Amino acid sequence: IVEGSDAEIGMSPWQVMLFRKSPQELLCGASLISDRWVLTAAHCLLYPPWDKNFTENDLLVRIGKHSRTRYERNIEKISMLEKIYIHPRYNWRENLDRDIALMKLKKPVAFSDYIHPVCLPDRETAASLLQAGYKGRVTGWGNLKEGQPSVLQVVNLPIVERPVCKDSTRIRITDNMFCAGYKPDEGKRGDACEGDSGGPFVMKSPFNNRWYQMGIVSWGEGCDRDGKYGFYTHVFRLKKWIQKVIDQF
């Protein structure tokens, strides 16, 4: 996260760390949506241009963390994956369209002050909240600069009009993405960055005071460049595949 701040303790209890067994490294962010299901970006697991293709046993999810590098004894839980599910039409060849995957944990996690799932949006929270100018919140342990934080970082960013997103890039933007970030003249900065992928873009409902995950940190060009924006998987547009996977398996 670039131009963010240190998270408060307990601030994002749904934030999950995707962790490589060996070499032991931070792969990506991810989010806890129930006691057994983690949501992340497909490109964290599967990205052939970079010879990235992880499987279940390659991987550990660490939940409840605040410190990037510490093993947080008595606070964090570390779980093994039972099954990764990538969207069947995830488009790694061209534009990272449908950049989304579900991971089933081998056993359920118990909730605590530091570990609690986020809501997925319904049609109407989506319609009401996903609007240009409205701010959401991104979190992660990724690079601070296009160097890495000791502690979870947080930044709040406004949703950007769809045409402005399209005109900022050569990349073909689809209906399954939105972009967020400050314009060059607005005079505030901030962006996700390398290592933040797969993490939650969340908004607080002003109707029921719950936090909803609207986006997954997907891709950008550099980090925090003026006139560039971060792009996110549109979780609501892909909710049907989420429901399907979850209650088939």
């Binding site: 067994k21 550990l60 590098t69 093993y71 570390i78």
Partner: peptide, 11 residues
């Protein structure tokens, strides 16, 4: 950089 975690998990 990363503090070692329980080997229970790296099993």
């Amino acid at each position: 950089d990363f503090e070692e975690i329980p080997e229970e998990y790296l099993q």
